[PDB]
Scaffold this active site. Structure first.
Site, PDB file in Angstrom:
ATOM      1  N   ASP A 158     -17.087  54.232  63.998  1.00  0.00           N
ATOM      2  CA  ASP A 158     -16.891  54.987  62.763  1.00  0.00           C
ATOM      3  C   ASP A 158     -15.531  54.619  62.181  1.00  0.00           C
ATOM      4  OD1 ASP A 158     -17.225  56.819  60.680  1.00  0.00           O
ATOM      5  OD2 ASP A 158     -16.349  58.463  61.838  1.00  0.00           O
TER       6      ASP A 158
ATOM      7  N   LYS B  41     -14.192  53.480  59.537  1.00  0.00           N
ATOM      8  CA  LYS B  41     -14.106  53.299  58.092  1.00  0.00           C
ATOM      9  C   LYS B  41     -12.695  53.606  57.594  1.00  0.00           C
ATOM     10  CE  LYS B  41     -16.280  57.857  57.509  1.00  0.00           C
ATOM     11  NZ  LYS B  41     -17.493  58.566  57.012  1.00  0.00           N
TER      12      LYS B  41
ATOM     13  N   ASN C 294     -10.611  56.750  57.820  1.00  0.00           N
ATOM     14  CA  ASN C 294     -10.162  57.201  59.134  1.00  0.00           C
ATOM     15  C   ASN C 294      -8.928  56.442  59.609  1.00  0.00           C
ATOM     16  OD1 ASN C 294     -12.065  59.240  59.509  1.00  0.00           O
ATOM     17  ND2 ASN C 294     -13.570  57.837  60.414  1.00  0.00           N
TER      18      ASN C 294
ATOM     19  N   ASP D  58      -9.993  60.348  64.098  1.00  0.00           N
ATOM     20  CA  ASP D  58     -11.375  60.790  64.272  1.00  0.00           C
ATOM     21  C   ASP D  58     -12.153  59.912  65.249  1.00  0.00           C
ATOM     22  OD1 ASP D  58     -13.876  61.931  64.068  1.00  0.00           O
ATOM     23  OD2 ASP D  58     -13.803  62.127  61.882  1.00  0.00           O
TER      24      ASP D  58
ATOM     25  N   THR E 106     -17.088  43.635  86.108  1.00  0.00           N
ATOM     26  CA  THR E 106     -18.544  43.569  86.043  1.00  0.00           C
ATOM     27  C   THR E 106     -19.204  43.898  87.380  1.00  0.00           C
ATOM     28  OG1 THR E 106     -20.437  42.137  85.521  1.00  0.00           O
ATOM     29  CG2 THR E 106     -18.533  41.112  86.594  1.00  0.00           C
TER      30      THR E 106
HETATM   31  C1  1LC Z   1     -10.415  65.699  60.233  1.00  0.00           C
HETATM   32  C2  1LC Z   1      -8.951  65.635  60.625  1.00  0.00           C
HETATM   33  C3  1LC Z   1      -8.556  66.065  61.864  1.00  0.00           C
HETATM   34  C4  1LC Z   1      -7.107  65.997  62.258  1.00  0.00           C
HETATM   35  C5  1LC Z   1      -6.171  65.496  61.382  1.00  0.00           C
HETATM   36  C6  1LC Z   1      -6.589  65.022  60.032  1.00  0.00           C
HETATM   37  C7  1LC Z   1      -5.549  64.475  59.072  1.00  0.00           C
HETATM   38  O1  1LC Z   1      -4.363  64.471  59.390  1.00  0.00           O
HETATM   39  C8  1LC Z   1      -5.949  63.916  57.719  1.00  0.00           C
HETATM   40  C9  1LC Z   1      -6.991  63.030  57.438  1.00  0.00           C
HETATM   41  N1  1LC Z   1      -6.988  62.794  56.071  1.00  0.00           N
HETATM   42  C10 1LC Z   1      -5.961  63.512  55.471  1.00  0.00           C
HETATM   43  N2  1LC Z   1      -5.574  63.597  54.194  1.00  0.00           N
HETATM   44  C11 1LC Z   1      -4.537  64.368  53.846  1.00  0.00           C
HETATM   45  C12 1LC Z   1      -3.825  65.104  54.793  1.00  0.00           C
HETATM   46  C13 1LC Z   1      -4.211  65.029  56.131  1.00  0.00           C
HETATM   47  C14 1LC Z   1      -5.291  64.224  56.472  1.00  0.00           C
HETATM   48  C15 1LC Z   1      -7.927  65.088  59.670  1.00  0.00           C
HETATM   49  C16 1LC Z   1     -11.239  64.458  60.361  1.00  0.00           C
HETATM   50  C17 1LC Z   1     -11.350  64.097  61.814  1.00  0.00           C
HETATM   51  N3  1LC Z   1     -11.433  63.832  62.923  1.00  0.00           N
HETATM   52  C18 1LC Z   1     -10.587  63.318  59.647  1.00  0.00           C
HETATM   53  N4  1LC Z   1     -10.765  63.147  58.229  1.00  0.00           N
HETATM   54  O2  1LC Z   1      -9.896  62.532  60.274  1.00  0.00           O
END
Ligand code: 1LC
Ligand code: NA
Length: 307
Positions: free
Chosen positions: A133, A135, A138, A155, A175
Site C-alpha cells: 500500500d 502510494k 502514505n 500506514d 531458505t
Molecule cells: C492515518 C494516520 C495515522 C497516524 C499519523 C498520520 C499523519 O501524521 C498524517 C498523514 N497525512 C497527514 N496530513 C496532515 C497532517 C498529518 C498527516 C496519519 C493513516 C494511517 N495509517 C494515514 N493517512 O497515514
C-alpha cells in the site's frame, strides 16, 4: 504457541493520558492528539478489533520503528474494543504535495528523495516485510525542514511479514525453513507492487502528472487499461528536459511484468541513483496542478483495489 505481549489490556487507559483532536488523513481512522503531560503533538490511529486484527502492523512498527525514515511508534493501547496506535505526527504534509509545488525542483533533488525512500524499502524487504500500500499519500514529511531525513513511510496497515508455515519469521535469504509456495510467490509480487508504486511516484515527480491517470474522473476501465497495457509515454513535451537515465529507470520500475521489474536493491544500483552527481540541476519543466494529480492518483489506486 508463544505469547505476543501485543495482546494487552493493561491498567492505564489511552484517553487517560491523551487528549484527542481533529481527524487526519483520508481508509484508516486517524486523529491528532496531545500528551496530557508534556503537551506535545502526536498522531493516533484507532482500529476496531472486531473489524480487523492490528497485531501484525503493531509488531512491524515495533521492530522496524527505529528506522529514521519509518514512522515511529511512541505509544500504544487497547481498551478492549479498540486499539490506539500512537505514533509521531506529520507536520510536513505529503511529500509529493510539497515537491509538486516547488517550481525549482531538479533531478539531482528528485534522485536524492527517491534514494532515501528506496533505501528504506530495501531494508524492509530484506527483513521479509512488504508494504502492499505504498502510494504517495502514505509518504510524508515529519517536519518542514525540507531534507530527506525528514521523510517518513507510513500506514503499515496492509503490511505483512515473511514467516514459515510453523510460524517462524524468516528473511527472503534464509531458505532452510519450510515455507508455503504460494506464500513465497505472493511475497514476491507484493515486493514488486511496492517498487511499482515507487515508479508511479518518480514518474509524477519528473513530469508533474500521473502516468496512468489524468484526473479524478477517469473511468476505472480506461485507467486499468493503461495499467494493463504496460505502455507509457516518455517522449512528450514535459519529457524534453529529462535525462535518459531517468526515462530508463522510470521504465524499469514500471515494467508491466513483475518478474522483469527491478527490485529495491537493483533500483539503487541504477546509474540515476548511483551517479546522482552527474544529474542535471536546472528546474524541471513540469505541469503545475498538484490538486488534479491528487485526484488522478486516488483514482488510480481506487480502481486497482476495486476487487
Ligand atoms: C492515518 C494516520 C495515522 C497516524 C499519523 C498520520 C499523519 O501524521 C498524517 C498523514 N497525512 C497527514 N496530513 C496532515 C497532517 C498529518 C498527516 C496519519 C493513516 C494511517 N495509517 C494515514 N493517512 O497515514
Ligand atoms: Na523512525
Amino acid at each position: 504457541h508463544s505469547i505476543v505481549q501485543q495482546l494487552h489490556r493493561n491498567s492505564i487507559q489511552f484517553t487517560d493520558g491523551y487528549e484527542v483532536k481533529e481527524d487526519i488523513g483520508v481508509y484508516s481512522v486517524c486523529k491528532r492528539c496531545i500528551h496530557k503531560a508534556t503537551n506535545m503533538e502526536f498522531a493516533v490511529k484507532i482500529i476496531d478489533k472486531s473489524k480487523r486484527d492490528p497485531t501484525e502492523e503493531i509488531e512491524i512498527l515495533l521492530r522496524y520503528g527505529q528506522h529514521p525514515n519509518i514512522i515511529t511508534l511512541k505509544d500504544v493501547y487497547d481498551d478492549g474494543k479498540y486499539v490506539y496506535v500512537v505514533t509521531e505526527l506529520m507536520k510536513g504534509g505529503e511529500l509529493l504535495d510539497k515537491i509538486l509545488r516547488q517550481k525549482f525542483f531538479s533531478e539531482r533533488e528528485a534522485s536524492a528523495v527517491l534514494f532515501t525512500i528506496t533505501k528504506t524499502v530495501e531494508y524492509l524487504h530484506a527483513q521479509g516485510v512488504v508494504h502492499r500500500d505504498l502510494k504517495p499519500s502514505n509518504i510524508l514529511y515529519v517536519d518542514e525542514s525540507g531534507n530527506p531525513e525528514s521523510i517518513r513511510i507510513c500506514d503499515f496497515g496492509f503490511a505483512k511479514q515473511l514467516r514459515a508455515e510453523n510460524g517462524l519469521l524468516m528473511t527472503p535469504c534464509y531458505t532452510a525453513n519450510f515455507v508455503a509456495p504460494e506464500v513465497l510467490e505472493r511475497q514476491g509480487y507484493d515486493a514488486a507492487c511496492d517498487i511499482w508504486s515507487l515508479g508511479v511516484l518518480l514518474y509524477t515527480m519528473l513530469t508533474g502528472y500521473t502516468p496512468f491517470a489524468n484526473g479524478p474522473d477517469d473511468t476505472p476501465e480506461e485507467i486499468l487499461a493503461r495499467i494493463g497495457s504496460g505502455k507509457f509515454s516518455l517522449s512528450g513535451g514535459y519529457w524534453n528536459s529529462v535525462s535518459d537515465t531517468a526515462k530508463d529507470l522510470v521504465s524499469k520500475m514500471l515494467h508491466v511484468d513483475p518478474h522483469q521489474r527491478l527490485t529495491a536493491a537493483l533500483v539503487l544500483r541504477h546509474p540515476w541513483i548511483v551517479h546522482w552527481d552527474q544529474l542535471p540541476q536546472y528546474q524541471l519543466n513540469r505541469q503545475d496542478a498538484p490538486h488534479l494529480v491528487k485526484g488522478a492518483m486516488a483514482a488510480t489506486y481506487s480502481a486497482l483495489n476495486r476487487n
